[PDB]
């Protein structure tokens, strides 16, 4: 599924991401935009043998288990295959644990490259929330 900007902002607000651990809603919408382009099916294999899954590109080496990645830790204790639903529930629950580490949203490379430092609030502007 491919969310519309405002559609996801409302979904993420409902899923408790507005001001979660110091990160405003715009951060998450912007992150989804550049990590998966709002696509819940996004799947990208990496150089280190891992793969990023879902709307928020959760990594198989640290967060979810895909059973084919070297040195898997599965911190979110969930199969990567379970993070590809149209229902963002599972990716949000895992995203919250990820950002609860001292590294915060820096875990999301695209967010770090395209959102951090920008007017993230712009991503929720012009939306009914």
């Amino acid at each position, epitope marked *: 599924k491919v969310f519309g900007r405002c559609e996801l902002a409302a979904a993420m607000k409902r899923h*408790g991401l*507005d*001001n*979660y*651990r110091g990160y405003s809603l715009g951060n998450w919408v912007c992150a989804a935009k550049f990590e998966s382009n709002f696509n819940t099916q996004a799947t990208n294999r990496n150089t280190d043998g891992s793969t990023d899954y879902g709307i928020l590109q959760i990594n198989s080496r*640290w967060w979810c288990n895909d059973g084919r990645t070297p040195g898997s830790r599965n911190l979110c204790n969930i199969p990567c295959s379970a993070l590809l639903s149209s229902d963002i529930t599972a990716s949000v629950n895992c995203a919250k644990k990820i950002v609860s580490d*001292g*590294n915060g949203m820096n875990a999301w490379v695209a967010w770090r490259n395209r959102c951090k430092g920008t007017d993230v609030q712009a991503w929720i502007r012009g939306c009914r929330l």
Partner: antibody
Amino acid sequence: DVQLQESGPSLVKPSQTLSLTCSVTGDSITSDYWSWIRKFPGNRLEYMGYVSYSGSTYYNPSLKSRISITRDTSKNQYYLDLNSVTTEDTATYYCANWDGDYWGQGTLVTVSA
Amino acid sequence: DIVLTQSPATLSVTPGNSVSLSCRASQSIGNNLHWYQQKSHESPRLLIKAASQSISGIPSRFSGSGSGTDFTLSINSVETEDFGMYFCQQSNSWPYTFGGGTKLEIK
């Protein structure tokens, strides 16, 4: 299955450092975030802090920077240090994983002269 | 810090009746509220996470609802084993905080 178990002295002196150990069985500590919570006499619960995978820590400001949470992978356990304790630190200490699915049995630590 | 208020702090009920416990936060916490049950002499037991998400192994009669600053833990047909303390905890902002707790007592 995963099991948590606190251990350490139950009686400590004022001004000393209170230290406890949480032994994790059933899985590796490298697969979760780990916290310490304590309950005071009166049904008052206080979240002390936790250590995440990167080793970064978050401590409750109420502890006034007297707390330290560390880990030891080879022993599959993590620890709690609370410096310069006072009778105000007497409570039941529990270790639990970050999301709260697993809790230790809790251990009463009394601070007395 | 975020202050969680659980009022009434004590609730008297007859087994079989349905009750709701309140937890209000001093500032919005989205859906980041967890409900715990703590029977005397025992470690807390997580009943509901993320305000309304069910937990495997927990009786079905327990459910949670709410968002923002007002949350509710609902018990459908209270059982004797349910008597005890119930605490809500927020994880939206650090430091994580607990409500003062609500004690479920028989009439």
